[model samples]
Target: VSTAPYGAWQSPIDAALVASRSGRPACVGAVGDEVWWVAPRPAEAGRATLVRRRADGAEESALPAPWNVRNRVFEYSGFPWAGVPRPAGGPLLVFTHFGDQRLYAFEPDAPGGAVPRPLTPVSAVGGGLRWADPVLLPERGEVWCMAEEFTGEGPSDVRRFLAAVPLDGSAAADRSAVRELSDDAHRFVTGPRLSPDGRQAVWLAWDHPRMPWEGTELKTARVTEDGRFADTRTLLGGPEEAIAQAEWAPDGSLIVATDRTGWWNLHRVDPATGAATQLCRREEEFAGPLWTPGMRWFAPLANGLIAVVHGKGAAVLGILDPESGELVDAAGPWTEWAATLTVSGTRAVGVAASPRTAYEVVELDTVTGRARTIGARHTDPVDPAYYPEPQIRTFTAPDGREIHAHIYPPHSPDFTGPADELPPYVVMAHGGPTSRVPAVLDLDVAYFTSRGIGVADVNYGGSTGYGRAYRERLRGRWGVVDVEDCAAVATALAEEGTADRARLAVRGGAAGGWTAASSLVSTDVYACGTVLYPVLDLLGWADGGTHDFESRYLDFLIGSFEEFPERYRDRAPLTRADRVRVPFLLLQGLEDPVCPPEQCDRFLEAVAGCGVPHAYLSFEGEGHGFRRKETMVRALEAELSLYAQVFGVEVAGVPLLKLGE
Candidate 1:
């Protein structure tokens, strides 16, 4: 090994490879014995491409580049693409095109080149028309989907309906040609789930100020002769109970995964009587937040078994028998099971990844009681020795709460830190304060670790994967709880000789950026901050100008607009701009509607030339999250440069960030 310092070690993992090597496996499903999912190819400007794995282990790209199987419904799309066996056309698939946000049907098994036929029309209104979580009905020749129609550019000027598009392509040019399956009553609606008896339909719906993670209503209706919902009634769920997912049993009984006992567990319900029976009542969760329109945490099998992603600490795949209320976990190294799931016969397929693995299609065969990878397997682009082996650590916060984090200690096989010198540490706060930092092999984290930069991805309070109670810890205390939790992890590590107290930094995006910036302003724990698409002002976010879904989410995170106005202002980083003492690197996506650029610009203006040192890098065409290779590379490099400069670490070839006084 070359004799080099820890932070300055020459490593193979770079910004470009980290951006390109990572794939976005969005959703997974089973097409008979084959497993299929959508992944982003940064080579195609981060287009969502569909890939399929055959039963015989053969892999093929189901949809080529430029044909994006994605939609922007609620911005966080789910179940964007769905497939079914067509009696006439063999196997067919329906997906939302990013270009037009219209549903298109494609014949996947067609021999020659088969162009996808548009099944929905292009709207001429605000944000146009979008569709997601489609349920194909060959009998009615219609595809049932959750439709988001933007009536105007205003945040609240949108309507959601359960609409049905014909497969005959008659609705391609005329919006009136699409059949309305259900009246637009709720602010949000998931795709319709048809009963096994084909007589009833069910789905989940929730309104603003109450996100899906908080609560949602399980609605059921009778399927009309012409394929529309009638006799609609709310079967379960309220402001306190959250029904994450639901499916119809083989005998028409409703199988639901709802969080009523402080955990999203399995339960059975009556379609006619609206009664309920708890199937699995463990403190662990079998379901999670339905952030998107088409989230599935559990898949129901025809044989009365349910394959569930259930665990408290780290998520795991399991199968539950409703009759005996017995849950058997599938043995595997995977601890994080994604929401996408598909069950066929006794074979259950899902998307999962581990601390040392990237996301791949995982299949659990219940008959054999074995789980194995069936799709895109993770093969390291670099040597495994260069990768950082993380520790699943739980450090106690000052308030006696155990703050969970996946600590990636500074690691480089070629070089190690000085025996007495602590390495710089970065606390990464994940977005969706309701979300969790899965213990997965993320090259981005590895990018820092290989260069001797330690990292701690904190799963502060309000993070999922934990039970509903732990998540509720941040319910009314968003900024305070999240900030204290992150600080606890960073300070705890420093106290334990796990980090350099003076060279600490915090970085995050979306909701996470809010925390990073808050940490910088509220405490001197971090020397610098990297805020990407962060929510800086609670007042602006409360002004009803942001995205419709999360516009009122701050009501719970902070407090209701009419309830506690000072808390929102006091907790917001923008309101405390004068308190910010550390240097910061601000990365904003100009097109980000969630955390708009104005917030970042305003923050910079408020603290300009405070002599804290800072730089603002804004990107066009990027929104909410950075997906493009060029944008990702720039963000990564800029972050690295800022860290190198502040920590006095020697890194080569990257241009230094010019921080203004």
Candidate 2:
């Protein structure tokens, strides 16, 4: 038995293993007794391939390499594929290829090699035409989806509307052949959902300065004789109400997940009068913030039962009866459910995970009340003994506000630190400063825990999963609220003797990276920080240099730039780079549009001659999020090396990071 000090204990779970398992499975759906989903292959240049599961429980890639089933709509993308079953042969699949962002149609059971043909033309503007959340209308010989078309050379010069693309491939090279079903009345629109009778269409729409979670309008329109939306009107949501997802019940009534009463609860709305009735009234959130388009939190079953992913902090799969208001959650060790659920008859399919298991495709049968892993099943790549024992912890701030966090202490079956020594901890802030940290198995967390380092995933205020009031805490206090909450959790752990206070570090990406950098500047709680593709300059972010989707995010995240320009400059980490006295590491994707590398470049320049040691690493071809295997491996190793050097831990196997003084 080896008894190494904390942060130096060896383990079987390495950076390579963590990188291999980093590709998460998502967008699970079913087509005629078969399940299909998007599977990520980081080893293959970070391509997201479509995989199909047959009736015999065999799974195969529907699209091979160089054929990425992904879209760039809104930058975060959405449901990139849709399938329809044919009575003659197999099924017809339509997806957006990432290479050109064009919709392609393919028949998996074609005679020779199945080759997908593009059904949409490339645009000559800002970003080419992109399609998402597709719906196959076999009877109409068309596929209806949300189309993003660039009209000018500017990034925000795009118009989003519902479009109908012909299945006959008439629009292959002709833009006019693609029919615009709905007008661009709103700034953003989700894919339309047709009513049971196919005479009514409905979708969610929102404008600038307000994200979908902040407020959205549920729009309904009549399907005209020419297959265009007519007499469109607001059905339910308004400026203060956020409608997450909407679907038509089997009985033709409109069902939606709306945050009208603080919590996101399930509701049934009248299509004629726009009257809404709550199906299940609870404090738990039935839907999450719409970070990506076409996010589904619930799917209506044919038997009238709605399968939902709902909970407080961590979500769970539940089957709710609309009429009786009876909700029963499926029994499983899985604690976190993704916002992708589809129902086929009485069965529901979704992606779920637990603290000890990675995300897997789970199928639940309503009749039997049984849930089983159908695809992407978790098999421990390394010994389970090396995994950390995680705990869902809640800490109270000085204001008596609740700060939720997942605490993973150092754990290695073969090695243990000295009884008198406390472990160093890395506090993680999730990307969507709007997102929450769920209690799920992340190999990245295990990579540190197995080697004697601890981790704390903070679900600070302004994060989703809790009610609207909780999320609105950072309304004009983005950097303050998120940073304070993270520091509170980290300080509590150290004060409680669960961590080494002097060796603590903070890490985050995107908005979370802003929090990490701000935490280092505003407080002395952390020794260093790892900022990945962060929003360093709020003024720069609000003025421009970002994507169109988040162009006006600072209007809500912080105060309006027009109203308070000084507030934006004051809260920016770049403004206080001289205040950062500790060592740090900055990571960025050179191609990241959301948080451009220029922000990091400016921060590094501002921090120059500050006598603070730091390192800057930029990746090519990587976007806001790293997906390639080598990139992830290098990133994970560099992050570990940063902690090791800052905390004075002599860890081996990881490459030594060189710092600029």
| Cα-based TM-score, every candidate | 0.97, 0.99
Q: Report each candidate's C-alpha RMSD, comma-separated, in the order given.
A: 1.5, 1.0
**Best lDDT goes to which candidate?**
2
Model 2, 472-505: lDDT tens digits are 9889988888999999999999999999988899
Task: Score each candidate by Cα lDDT.
Answer: 0.85, 0.90
Alpha-carbon runs more than 4 Å astray in model 1: 87-89
lDDT of 1 by residue, 154-204 (tens): 877899989989889999998899988888899998999998778899999
Model 2 alpha-carbon drift over 4 Å, by segment: none
Candidate 2, pairs of clashing residues: none
